């Protein structure tokens, strides 16, 4: 095997249909506390000429 440039139509996500019905519900029986980093600029360098 070897490496090269391929090209492809991009995938949007996994195809994932849902078990909907007019009398069924899914309820979570357990949970995960998650921690996620979000980063924002607040300043840039002050500059003079």
């Amino acid at each position: 095997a070897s490496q090269s440039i391929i090209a492809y139509t991009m995938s949007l996500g996994a195809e994932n249909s849902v078990a909907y019905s007019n009398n069924s519900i899914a309820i979570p029986t357990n949970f995960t506390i998650s921690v996620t980093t979000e980063i924002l600029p607040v300043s840039m360098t002050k500059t003079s000429v």
Partner: protein, 133 residues
């Protein structure tokens, strides 16, 4: 203001999940937020109903939702499976069961009932022993 000094109900404003709290950390020219979020992880199917019919009267959850494991009916909170036995203190009444589409038949328990009934057995065992003189 809304993720560190507070708690946010704005969906995906303080990261994905439901917002618990967030911690600021400084970085060069910016800020990092460590958002903490509750994420509903493992799920199980249940049958469900909009209402219960009991005494012809239709019943709804005060808070939470109705579910069945297939043989018995429970109220449970919308975001986490903890089942409770369907009492008059879990639910409230309106109209009658002609009006609600998809309504189902189950008993609704009354926590006043054994507390008077066991007092009826006390009242009776005294009335009967009071026949002895």
């Amino acid at each position: 203001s809304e993720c560190v000094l507070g708690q946010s109900k704005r969906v995906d404003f303080c990261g994905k999940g439901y917002h618990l709290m967030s911690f600021p950390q400084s970085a060069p020219h910016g800020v990092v937020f460590l958002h903490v979020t509750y994420v509903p992880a493992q799920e199980k199917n249940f049958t469900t109903a909009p209402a219960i019919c009991h005494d012809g009267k239709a019943h709804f959850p005060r808070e939470g939702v109705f579910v069945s494991n297939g043989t018995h009916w429970f109220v449970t909170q919308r975001n986490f499976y903890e089942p409770q036995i369907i009492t008059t203190d879990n639910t409230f009444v309106s109209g009658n069961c002609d009006v609600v589409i998809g309504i189902v038949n189950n008993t609704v328990y009354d926590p006043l009932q054994p507390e008077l009934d066991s007092f009826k057995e006390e009242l009776d065992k005294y009335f009967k022993n009071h026949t002895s003189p």
